[PDB]
Amino acid sequence: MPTPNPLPVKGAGTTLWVYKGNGDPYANPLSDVDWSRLAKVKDLTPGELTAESYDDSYLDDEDADWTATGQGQKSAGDTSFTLAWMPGEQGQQALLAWFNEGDTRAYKIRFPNGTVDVFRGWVSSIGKAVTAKEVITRTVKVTNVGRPSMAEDR
Amino acid sequence: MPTPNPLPVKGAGTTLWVYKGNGDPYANPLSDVDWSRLAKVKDLTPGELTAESYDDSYLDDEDADWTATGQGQKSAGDTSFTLAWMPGEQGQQALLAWFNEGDTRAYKIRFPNGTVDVFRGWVSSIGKAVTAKEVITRTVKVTNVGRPSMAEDR
Amino acid sequence: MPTPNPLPVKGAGTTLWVYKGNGDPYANPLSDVDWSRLAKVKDLTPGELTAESYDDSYLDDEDADWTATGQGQKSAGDTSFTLAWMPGEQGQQALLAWFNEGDTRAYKIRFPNGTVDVFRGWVSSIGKAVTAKEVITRTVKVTNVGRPSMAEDR
Amino acid sequence: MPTPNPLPVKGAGTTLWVYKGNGDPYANPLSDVDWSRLAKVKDLTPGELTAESYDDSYLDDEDADWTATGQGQKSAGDTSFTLAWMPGEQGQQALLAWFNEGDTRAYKIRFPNGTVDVFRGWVSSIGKAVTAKEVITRTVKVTNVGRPSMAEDR
Amino acid sequence: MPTPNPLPVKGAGTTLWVYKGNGDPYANPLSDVDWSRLAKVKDLTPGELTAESYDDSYLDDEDADWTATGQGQKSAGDTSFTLAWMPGEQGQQALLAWFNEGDTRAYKIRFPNGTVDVFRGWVSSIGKAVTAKEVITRTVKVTNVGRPSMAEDR
Amino acid sequence: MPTPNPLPVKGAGTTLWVYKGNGDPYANPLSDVDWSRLAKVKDLTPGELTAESYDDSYLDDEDADWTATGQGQKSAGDTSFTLAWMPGEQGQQALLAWFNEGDTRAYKIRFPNGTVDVFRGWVSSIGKAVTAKEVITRTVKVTNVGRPSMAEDR
C-alpha cells in the first residue's frame, strides 16, 4: 500500500485535476491546495510525446547507404479522458468554461504512486454518448502546448 | 427517480424535439409549449464540439523545441439519430419538410435529468434500412451552425 | 395487418418495380398498371439523400468563432438491391436492357404500408456472386438523378 | 435437374473455358468444340460491369438544387478465379502462355443453367498460396477489354 | 507419393534455396549442386506477377462506350518468407550478406512436385519477432527484377 | 539450456540495455560492463531493416517488358518496446533524459542465445496506458540512424 516509485503499480486510483488559476503550476505539483478535481473518471489515455524526424544528409557526405536523421521539434500529444456526465458538478461546468474561453490551462494526473503528471493545454474536443443501459458519458480531449512536467523530473 | 444533476444517470429516457417556429429558442428551453416530439428513437449520437488548432510559432521566439498552438474556430459537429419509420407521423413529415426547405431549425435533446441540450442546425442526411425481420428505420443526420446552448449553461 | 402509416412496421414484404415506359411516373404511384416487378429480392438498401455544406462566412462578420454553413445542392444517393439470378425473367432482361441503353428510368419501392418510394435514375453497377451452396445472386446499384418522390409527399 | 432459366439455381457446377484460337468467339458460345477447360476451380468472382458518371449540369439550367448525371463509358471489371496448382495440365500452361504473350483472349463461364458468359480480356495477375495442410492454389485475375456477351443476350 | 504434375498437391514439403554464385541460374534448376538451403521455413508467400493496364483509346475510334485496354510492363511481385532465427546457420549469414551487399541473386522454391520456381531479386526487408512462448522468427521479403522462370516452362 | 546458435530458440529471456556513455559501442557488445538495464519488459518489436527500390530502366534498353530495379538507401526501422512504469528506476529516468536531450544513443537487445543486437538511434515516441486492473505501462519507440551491428556479424 505505501507507494513504491521503483516498483510497478496498478492503474487503479488515478485521479485528474485542473488548476484553479493561481501562478506557477509546475512549482509544487504534489499539493492539491488549488486544484479542482474531475471525479467519476471512466478511462484516461495520457498524451503521447512524439518527435519529428529531421533530415541530416548532405551531398558531400561519404556514407550515403543508410539514412541519417536526428530528433527535431518534439511535441506533446493529446490527452483523452471520459467522465460520467454530471452537468451540476462544478468541475464539468469549469471544463466547458475552459472550452468556451479558449485559454490554455494546467491539468494534473495523480497516479497511485507519489508522482504527478502536469500538462498545459487547451481542450479541442467534447462529446457525449447516450445509451439505454449505460450511464451517459462525456468524452474530452485536450491538446497540449508543450514542455510537460513529467513525473520523473521529481 | 428525482433527477439528480450532480449524480450520474443512465441514458434511458432521452427524448428529441424540434422547434415549431416561434422566436428565441434558447430562451426557456425547459418548456415544451412549442416543441414537437420525434417519438420512437432507436439510438442517438449527439454532436461533437471540436476545434481547429491555430499555429502560434514565430521565427523570433527562442523556444522552438516544442509545438505551441492555440484554440481557434470551434465548431459543433453532426448529430445523428435513428427513428422508427412512421410516414404518417407529423414529426417525420415536418422533418422532411425541414430537409426540402433547407432552413436551419432548433432541435432539443431532453435527458432523464432536468437538463436540455439545444442546437441549431440543418439536416444533411436522410436514409432508410429495410430488413425482413427488423422494423424499417430512418436515419437522420443534422449539421449544426454553431453556438450550442449546452445543458450546463443552465 | 391493415397497413398503419402512423405505426412502425417490419420490412418484410417490400417489393420493387420498374416503369414500363408511359408518361408521368410521379403521378399516381400507388397503381401497378404499368410497372414491371423485380421478383426474388434478397436485400435492398435505398438511396441516402445527402447534401453538400455551403460556406457562409465573410471577412466582415463579427462572430468568427463558430463555423456557419448552409445546405447546398442536395443529392439522392445510390440504391443497391440484390436479386436471385433468373436470366429468363423478363424483369432482369429489361434491367440489362436498361444498363446497355443508358437511359434514366423510374423505379418504385413498395413498402408493406400503403406508401411508395419513387426514384428516377440510371444503373451504374451490375455484378454476380457464384457460390457452391448458395443461389446465384445478381447485385445491382442505381444512381439517382435527383428530385425523389418520397412516401410522405403522399 | 433440367436447367430452368426462369428459375434460380445454385452455383455448384460452374465451369471455365478458354478459346483455343479460332474466329468469332461470340458466335455460338454454347458449343465446346474449340474451348479448353480449366479444371479444379476453387472459387470464381466474375467481372463487375461498372460505369462512370458523366456530369450534365450547365450554368443556364434553372433546377440547380439536385445533381443531374448520366451514364458514360461503361467498363467491364476484373474476373478473379482460383484453381488447384497443376503445372502439368495443358490449361495452366496455356494460361501462363497467355500471361507471357500479352494478347487478349476470350474466356467463357458455363453456369449450371443452359447459359454462358463470354468475356474478352488479358490476364493481369497470377499468384500462389503455399500452406502446409492445404492444396497449393493458383489465383488468377483477368482484366476485360469491354463489350461482354452476357448470358441474357441469348 | 510419386510426384504427379497433373494432379493437385499439398504444400507440405516446400523448400527454399539461394544460388551460391555460379553462372546461368535458369539453366538446369532441378539440380541442387550449387544451391544453399534455407532450412526451418515457417511460411512462404511467393511473388504475385502483376501487370499495368495500358490505355488504348483514341479520339478517332467509333466505339467509345466501353473501356479498351491492353497489358503493359508486367512485373514480378515480392516474395515473403519467415524462417526460424538461427544466426549461426550459414544460410542466414549469407542472407544478410546479400542484404548488406545489394546485389540481385537467384532464389529457388522447390515444391513437393518435380517442379521448381526460380526468381532473381534483391532483398528489401528483414525483420524479427520476439515473443515469450514462441521461437524467434526472421521475416524476409525479396523484390524481383523480372523475367521469372516459372515451373511450367519446364 | 546451453545457448545453441544453430538451433532455434524461444524468445523468453530477451533483455534490453542502453549504453552508459563510453566509446565504441559496436566493439565488444557481449560485455555488460557499461550498459544499464531496462528491467520489466512486457513486449518488444525490433526494427525492420527495409530498403527503397531504385529504378534502373533506360529508354535504350531492349527488354522493356519486365520491371528492373535495384536496392538503394537501406534504412533501419523503428524499435518499439513496452516496459512497466517505474518512475524511480534509474533506467527510465535515463530514458526520458535521452528523450529530452535529443542525442542518439546505442541500445542493445540480448537474446537467450549468445548473440546481441546493437542499434544506434534516438527515441521518437513515449506514451502511457492507464487501466484499472492492469499495471501502468510505458511504451517507447526509437528511430535508428543506420548501420546496425546485427548478431550474425559476430
Numbering used by the authors:
A (entry chain B), B (entry chain E), C (entry chain F), D (entry chain D), E (entry chain C), F (entry chain A): 1 to 154
Excerpt from the publication:
Here we used *de novo* model building to identify a protein contaminant within a recombinantly-expressed protein sample as the helical tail of the YDC107 bacteriophage. All top 100 hits pointed to the *Escherichia coli* phage tail protein, specifically phage YDC107 – an unclassified *Ravinvirus* from a *Caudioviricetes* class. Structural analysis revealed that the central part of the phage tail has a C6 symmetry, however the overall symmetry of each segment is C3 due to dimerization of a flexible domain.
